[PDB]
């Protein structure tokens, strides 16, 4: 299973931290709210990192 194809995971913590995830339906890296803990791998600190890791998945 390709971690780039998993839906973005906010997690249980209560921060409002903007991260990137690869949205395979749209074919691009998009922003989402990360709660600050227990990140899954489809969670990047920049669009560039997301594109590098997941682009074209």
């Amino acid at each position: 299973p390709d971690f780039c194809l998993e839906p973005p995971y906010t997690g249980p913590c209560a921060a409002r931290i903007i991260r990137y995830f690869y949205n395979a339906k749209a074919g691009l890296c998009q922003t989402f709210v990360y709660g600050g803990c227990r990140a899954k791998r489809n969670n990047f600190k920049s669009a560039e990192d997301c594109m590098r890791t997941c682009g074209g998945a």
Binding site: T10, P12, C13, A14, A15, R16, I17, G35, G36, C37
Partner: protein, 223 residues
């Protein structure tokens, strides 16, 4: 904050916003140079915003002061969330006034049923997303350790407590992390985690500040 109310400008003068180009966490001012927040709110380049009400507008009482140190508890566990506390030193001392004021640390732990004030600029919807301009407040009781463990089997450590309402509708939510739970004028909790927001049977979980008072005082003093 879901199910709360508008605090009123500067009515919670110890509440700060942590900003990294946008609001991402809260915190609590404990003296003119130090803020308490959550360890999972650690970021480099934090700016602390004091005296805020409308966080999307410059209204006249703000102080914006960069963090000079952001110190996570040395035993923070990013898997179990144990020891979810962080101390932020301000690069210059805040000017204390009626709208910017410190909150006292506890002298003893609070009991189940004690009513507290929880505040923040987090999401106000249990389903969906709406972030407020102005600070929101919620009154909620501390819950028993037994009830907390029943809600979250295997997950509650001695450094956590639950607060809220088991029927749902009232809770902290994303963007509230790091902010205050104040009971009888003492900082007893830090917004930490939960399962969704304001869901039935899933109260919020908070860092138990009374367990850290000696560590907070000594860490502040040695930095």
């Amino acid at each position: 904050i879901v199910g709360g109310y508008t605090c009123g400008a500067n009515t919670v003068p110890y509440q700060v916003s942590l900003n990294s180009g946008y609001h991402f966490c809260g915190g609590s001012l404990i003296n003119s140079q130090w803020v308490v927040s959550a360890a999972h709110c650690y970021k480099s380049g934090i700016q602390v915003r004091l005296g805020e009400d409308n966080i999307n507008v410059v209204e006249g009482n703000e102080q914006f002061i960069s963090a000079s140190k952001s110190i996570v508890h040395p035993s923070y566990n990013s898997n179990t969330l144990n020891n979810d506390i962080m101390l932020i030193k301000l690069k210059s001392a805040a000017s204390l006034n009626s709208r910017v004021a410190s909150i006292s640390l506890p002298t003893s732990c609070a009991s189940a049923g004690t009513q507290c004030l929880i505040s923040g600029w987090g999401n106000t919807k249990s389903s969906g997303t709406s972030y407020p301009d102005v600070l929101k407040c919620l009154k909620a009781p501390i819950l028993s350790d037994s009830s907390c463990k029943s809600a979250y089997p295997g997950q509650i450590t001695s450094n956590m407590f639950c607060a809220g309402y088991l029927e749902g509708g009232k809770d902290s939510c994303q963007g509230d992390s790091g902010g205050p739970v104040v009971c009888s004028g003492k900082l007893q909790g830090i917004v930490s985690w939960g399962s969704g927001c304001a869901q039935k049977n899933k109260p919020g979980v908070y860092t138990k500040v009374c367990n850290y008072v000696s560590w907070i005082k000594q860490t502040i003093a040695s930095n």
